[PDB]
């Protein structure tokens, strides 16, 4: 899976967590296998105004 | 005083029904032994602990 988030937010991807990211965007399982992989994207992501 | 072995049979099973009942209340190093607690206080991942 993928996304962009602003950089605060990355502490709701985690196995059952809650918050307005997990519980009415993106949500993983109680029992989630698997690896959550990050990084800042201002350079890719970010434009003026 | 007299019939002491049919009284001690009586006894002793009422004293082991009683202290397995007693064990309820017993927090067992548990943030509480009132299950409910648990249930109402905790979020899943520590409620599981």
Same mark, same amino acid.
Request: with cysteine.
């Given at each position: ?13 985690? *196995?059952?967590? /809650?918050? @307005?990211?997990?519980?009415? @965007?993106?949500?993983? *399982?109680?029992?989630? /296998? ?7 994207? @201002? @350079? ?6 | ?6 009284? &001690?049979? !009586?006894?002793? %099973? #009422? ?11 017993? %927090? ?5 032994? !009132?299950? %409910? &607690?648990?249930?109402?206080?905790? &979020?899943? !991942?520590? #409620?599981? !602990?």
């Amino acid at each position: 899976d993928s996304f962009v988030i602003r950089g605060d937010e990355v502490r709701q991807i985690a *196995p059952g967590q /809650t918050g @307005n990211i997990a519980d009415y @965007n993106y949500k993983l *399982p109680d029992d989630f /296998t698997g690896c959550v992989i990050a990084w800042n994207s @201002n @350079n890719l992501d970010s434009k003026v105004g | 005083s007299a019939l002491g072995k049919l009284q &001690d049979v !009586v006894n002793q %099973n #009422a004293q082991a029904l009683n202290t397995l009942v007693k064990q309820l209340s017993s %927090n067992f190093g548990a943030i509480s032994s !009132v299950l %409910n &607690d648990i249930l109402s206080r905790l &979020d899943k !991942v520590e #409620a599981e !602990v």
